[PDB]
Amino acid sequence: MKRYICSFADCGAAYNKNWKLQAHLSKHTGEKPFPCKEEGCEKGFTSLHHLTRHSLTHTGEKNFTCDSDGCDLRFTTKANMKKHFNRFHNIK
DNA sequence: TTGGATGGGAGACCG
DNA sequence: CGGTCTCCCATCCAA
Ligand SMILES: [Zn+2]
Ligand SMILES: [Zn+2]
Ligand SMILES: [Zn+2]
Structure with missing residues (x-):
């Protein structure tokens, strides 16, 4: 529940997950x-x-297999699999 | 055009 | 409450 707040107060950004706050702070801090x-x-x-x-x-570990017979292309990430699936099938 | 590859982010799993 | 993980986008990236 305790969202960790961005050091640069005025920014008003806050996230409970440290990783999220790190990713946020990276924009300011590098x-x-x-x-x-x-x-x-x-x-x-x-x-x-x-x-x-x-x-x-x-x-x-290429494993995200497009669930399409024949077109069983294996992708690196679920999102890459989704992009392909969209691009080649869920075009609508 | 395409899937490999990275910063960012909600949500799931575990404690 | 918060790290690891689950799941995903948008974007960058090399082909
Ligand atoms: Zn900030
Ligand atoms: Zn496919
Ligand atoms: Zn590496």
Whole structure:
């Protein structure tokens, strides 16, 4: 219930989830608390789990299978699967 | 045009 | 109340 409020008071932004507030604060601070560390791919995520879905790309865990016979295309994320599904089927 | 890939965000799961 | 996870968009990104 205790939404954590954005340091820059006037902004009036508030979120109980720390990750959310980090992602918010990143806009002002430029901070990215969840780095990937990996050489070259030294990415800076502002929230946990977004890092984990990114990790699907390192692990190669392509799995979000379009539920369409024959067109059983496997995508990296549910949203990518949805975009495809929309783009190719749910065009309406 | 397309699916791979990232910042941002409501909601689900767990405690 | 709050981290990890579930689920997703919009956008960026390389093909
Ligand atoms: Zn703010
Ligand atoms: Zn990485
Ligand atoms: Zn399809």
